[PDB]
Design a protein around this ligand. Structure first.
Ligand SMILES: [Zn+2]
Length: 61
């Protein structure tokens, strides 16, 4: 029930190792913004859009 599972649901599975290698845990991921994601190196626009949408959803009750 963690970041690897989430990414698999979003079709972002190939990015799981990027975040793991950068020591990004689920809690930290859920605090990220678009600027942070670009700074993190997620250049692929679509991957970034899906991540932000997931972040958005998990911050809503
Ligand atoms: Zn947009």
């Amino acid at each position: 029930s963690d970041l690897p599972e989430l990414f698999s649901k979003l079709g972002l599975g190939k990015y799981t190792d990027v975040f793991q290698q950068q020591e990004i845990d689920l809690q930290t991921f859920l605090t990220l913004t678009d600027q942070d994601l670009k700074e993190l190196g997620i250049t692929t626009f679509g991957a970034r859009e899906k991540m932000l949408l997931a972040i958005s959803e998990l911050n809503k009750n």
